[PDB]
């Protein structure tokens, strides 16, 4: 999930965009 | 864009910014 990808680890902008509607 | 850990309200604010008119989903149990 997003917490594991972007908080516990680090997300690129592209990875953040996987959580857009 | 920053390259760092984004957590909690900071993660939500980043999604709000990045996603723009599309909107986003914040589902932290996922
Ligand atoms: Zn803070």
From Swiss-Prot, chain A:
Disulfide bonds join 6-11. Coiled coil: none annotated. This is Insulin A chain. It comes from Bos taurus.
UniProtKB/Swiss-Prot annotation, chain B:
This is Insulin B chain. It comes from Bos taurus.
């Amino acid at each position: 999930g997003i917490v594991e990808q972007c908080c516990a680890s680090v997300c690129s902008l592209y990875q953040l965009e996987n959580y857009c509607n | 864009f920053v390259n760092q850990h984004l957590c909690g309200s900071h993660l939500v604010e980043a999604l709000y910014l990045v996603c723009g008119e599309r909107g986003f989903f914040y589902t932290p149990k996922a």
